[model samples]
Target chain A: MADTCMSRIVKEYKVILKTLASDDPIANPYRGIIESLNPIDETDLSKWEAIISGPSDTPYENHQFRILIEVPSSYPMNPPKISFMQNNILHSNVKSATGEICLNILKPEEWTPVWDLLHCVHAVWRLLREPVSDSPLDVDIGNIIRCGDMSAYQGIVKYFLAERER
Target chain B: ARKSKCIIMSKSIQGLPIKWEEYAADEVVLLVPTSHTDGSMKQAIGDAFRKTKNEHKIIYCDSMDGLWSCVRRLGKFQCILNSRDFTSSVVPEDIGRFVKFVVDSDVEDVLIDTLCN
Candidate 1:
């Protein structure tokens, strides 16, 4: 009986893997880095992957920023945990070293079960455009960003870009 | 003749039977009790209307201060009536109408008092 259950679970997993590979909305954004996003271990239930892009019209423009997304076992209903994997890139909402985000939607107070994976990805992108200072993870970065110190902010952006290029 | 409106009331709870009356007068008054959260009070008010035989619009006022504001705003109504908790100290003449009193713990009781007045 246990063997039958294991076999069914494996079969279901295989079908899911196939479906994920062909899913259009999920595939298009990570076209080149799909392999990078692939589960490091086939047996592992959790998956971690990142996508980086330059924020247009900011000092960070032309510089790539990497965002890490971690999916829990019960996904779709439970929102995925997101972070910025890139080092030294400073933002009020993101941790300087680990890149963890601080946003209301990610909190239990604001989280709704109806949110999906795509919504999380888009929210990360939007955070770059408008970083919330009211509840900042990094006070210094928050102050600078709020005061509009484009030069100091640009320095951090350049440092990350240089590291990624190397 | 002035345009008149009719009120309706009915009540039902999960597997429970209930009944009440609806006020049809143009000037319907509502008096909600204190020390209750807005959500619970609203639910209680809705349940009260459901119990009534007359289907009347139930308005819930939070405090004596709030009741005064409602009275001022709903000028079409000649008088405002509420629980003693709301208008006990103030004289009926001073309040511009004969304020009636209803004593009950539930939202429906408040509704009934308003309807009776």
Candidate 2:
């Protein structure tokens, strides 16, 4: 699962934990995007479970994205490896079987200390609507978008979005 | 100490600079930050979000690079990470302190080569 994230990326989880507790639906906007997010261990930021809802405008809009969170040992200087649990997503940068996302910022060389899970979530939300065409991870699909064959791109996305039992 | 001196940012965004409502659900406008972490549109967009019936439709990004970073993820949002065995997990937030411990505690071991000696 290319877009799947199991991150070891963490800091002030105690602070972040409290951030979502209010349930006011005003201060914490993520309530709509994340159905549920919980730590597997109270002290471990490296392990967790999350349910992410897809955006309305993307191919993933109809599905519920379940992911595993594993923060890397290096912590903030690096990214937590996020992974998918239930199903495979059909995306240009993803592996249909494993659900690993391939964004450069998530890599060690580009990872910055200032970014956090919240930022990662926002980054993901934005990615769903706008895919990068400059580079093609899945050559066929990526090329379709890169070469300006959007009608075909839409058809592929539609076909990929269909329910598949995994 | 007084209300008169207080700077209320949310109050300042009363008038919107861009036509936010007209933007399509798929359209994303890149913004440069002004006086605050969020651009002048922060309050405007936040208000738009607050007014939205469904929050999934609108998103707020803190940085331009992060916004681009998100675009990169879409290129491969459905790939998988191969794994099976489970291992120890931890969250190390204080990197400076963590690395400090590395240098501070390992001095004796490094200088003396204690493992070999």
Candidate 3:
């Protein structure tokens, strides 16, 4: 007999794995998409990490962005918590130190059970293309993005890269 | 049993067609367009339902990318039967099977459609 919780975890795991294996454009929104879908330790479901390349045709292109995924106790029905884990992510939606993201889908109000890990990854890629203005974690970057100040945004991106090199 | 209807919401991008598939049932698949992310897609999908002749409830997904996740949960429905290429390539039967399975027992068929990119 299989443990019910374990079975549920296995099922969820398979779903996520199959999604990664598929060639859905949404599945690999970023450049350095994870080639392998590693299994997460059941002991620590939260604090999961993955590596992704920045999307093409963007300023962050060719840059590798690390990601952290956290599934709260109430997951599947709720969106998993996500944030950038690497350096040089100078965006209005992301927190500089903690890498906390200000995405709506991750919030309780917008979360739905159907959304899974892949959804979170896609959301990040979309953020690179169109940063949100309504709820910004980086206030200064948000103001610049909202005002369409490309020079300021580029300056911030350059600053982040320089800081990361130090 | 009434036959389930299919609605395709399509837009032209750079002269190429971008399509999003949706269905009507107990737990319907919603398509939140790239243009609107703030619950307006849900309201728009609902409005499309009101204008249509079909009788069914509409439940909208938060993002266009959420389609696959929705399909996975609604396993009764297969892959979308006919999908045009873009960011994703879906099998043809997916959408058809989903519509069929969702409204299998319903007495009245419903038509649901909404704008998406």
Candidate 4:
């Protein structure tokens, strides 16, 4: 049973890699947002790094964010975890200290078997533009934005981004 | 006109179960699948339960399986409403809407309250 499960996981990884090859930027939903995505290690599709550009006109524009997408052995059966790389964290939906994010679609209740790694990357990008005002993982940050403190919130965001580099 | 939307929609878990991918940005939608009652789906929902900024707590599950999926994901769920009888219609190998996990309201409480009376 363990080998059978192991083979299924490897097979799903292949499916994700091939799907990445077929996803065209021009036609794909994540067109402008995702700059590029590559695996951190050569043979492991389980781990990857994606470069996401903030949407134009938002305070986050011009900022380049690196996010990590880690897939569990369950693959399509389970949703992968998406978190910002250490040091870069600025969003009501994400944690500044850890970079873990709150995206409902990635949740199991909302997750579907049809989804792939491509779906996770695209959702994380969309989350950057519209941080949920009503529900925030970081209550302090959520309150900061909720109270109309854009300038203050943006400052924290910038600081986090810069810190991410070193 | 409110329940109007639920009328024509696909009630079968196999037909048109809610896909979080479509509404992850934010919104309310149902996930239908008997299989979702298991670990993979439970863990996904637990991810939501672990978050306070994510408003997935107010979700209305179709079955007790979804109800428990939500409860296990977030201890003591927010508001999952699915009656005991209707809860069996969710998803998985069954592939039908018969995945009800819970019935309407207060079955356990009522049994205690009414039975003692």
True contacts kept of 1: 0.00
**Deviation from native of the Cα of residue A52 in model 3, angstroms:** 1.8
Which lDDT tens digits does candidate 2 get at residues B1-117?
Answer: 111010111212223243444332222222222222334445465455346322233223343233223233233211111111112231123323312221111133331231111
Prediction 3 global C-alpha lDDT: 0.49
Off by over 4 Å in 3: A1-8, A18-43, A86-88, A162-166, B1-117
Count of clashes in candidate 1: 18
lDDT of 4 at A92: 79
Between prediction 1 and prediction 4, the one with superior lDDT is 4
Q: Per-residue lDDT of A1-166 in model 2, one digit per residue for the tens?
A: 2122223333346545776676877777776676667778877646877777777777677776776777666666668777665335656665556676666668777888787766675565556677776564455456555555443344345434542421
**Across all candidates, what is each one's fraction of true contacts kept?**
0.00, 0.00, 0.00, 0.00
Task: Give lDDT tens digits, candidate 3, residues A1-166.
Answer: 2344345545767866666666767754432555333445656655566666666665566566777777665556557667776444877788767888888777778777666666577777778877777877766556555555453354336434433544
lDDT of 1 at A138: 66
The lDDT per prediction is 0.47, 0.46, 0.49, 0.52
Which is the better candidate, 3 or 4, if ranked by TM-score? 4
- Tens-place lDDT digits, model 3, residues B20-98: 2233322222332333233233344455445642223322333333333334323333122223323352333444543
- lDDT per residue, candidate 4, A23-128, as tens digits? 6864555655776777688577578788888887665777888888887767667888889876476677888569888899987789987776666778888888
Per-candidate interface DockQ score? 0.01, 0.01, 0.01, 0.01
- True-vs-predicted CA distance for residue A156, candidate 3, Å: 2.6
